[PDB]
Amino acid sequence: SGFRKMAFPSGKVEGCMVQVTCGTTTLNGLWLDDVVYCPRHVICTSEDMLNPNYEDLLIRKSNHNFLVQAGNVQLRVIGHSMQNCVLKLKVDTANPKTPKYKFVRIQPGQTFSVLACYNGSPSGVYQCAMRPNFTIKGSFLNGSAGSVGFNIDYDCVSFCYMHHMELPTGVHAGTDLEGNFYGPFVDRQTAQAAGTDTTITVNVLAWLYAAVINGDRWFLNRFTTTLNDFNLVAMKYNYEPLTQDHVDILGPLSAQTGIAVLDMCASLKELLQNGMNGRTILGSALLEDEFTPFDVVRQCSGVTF
């Protein structure tokens, strides 16, 4: 019993974290096989950030200008190219600790674990969610660029995020491992703004199922509802439109608990209107939405890696 914001075991990723230095600027890199992935603004300085011409700035760089340190062992850079907003440093040694790994681009609403690194040394791990506006409510200080986000399946690490920037509102923006930003942001120190952020409805529903699974049940009712009678209230409280796809993805949890999706939906409707009125759910007076349906099954069934 119990339900916590659980992050993936980070052991496989820690062995891939290296440091990447370029003049005065240090950040983090990801060492997989004989390539080190890192954000391209490592070639920038603290005065080349308003509107940096990355093409030109890279031209003036050679292999030797990239200091790549795995621990205190320097890695020889034998190549370098730029793919979107990320930099690929070809090194002469394949990482012995390379895990089984893929690159994926997640969708808004999906979650992943962030391994926050500084100077190439992992310092903390936490679970985050790709918010609908394509930002993340992370915890990042200067030097955290190159920190990666990831999921695990069996023994295959799926890297889905590399950290680049902090937006003016304190939220964070980054890329997939191909260098394509999530959302419309760019790696320049300009005034960019995140769109309006909704709540991830399908994730809150999964969270309630995890509540029921754990014995929190003051919120269930006998009333049920339709999908469209529900979305009318959803679109009223800045909630994502629930689709049949979402109802389907919640199938395995409805079956496990016995509560139909639409009944738990109605329970959410009154929680949205009347509220919690003092009582908590899984230790929270707010409706958590950073748990996917698979996030609940993994935690509640003890899936291991």
């Binding site: 603004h41 937006l167 003016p168």
Partner: peptide, 6 residues
């Protein structure tokens, strides 16, 4: 306020 590359 402007974005901060970290």
């Amino acid at each position: 306020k402007v974005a901060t590359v970290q």
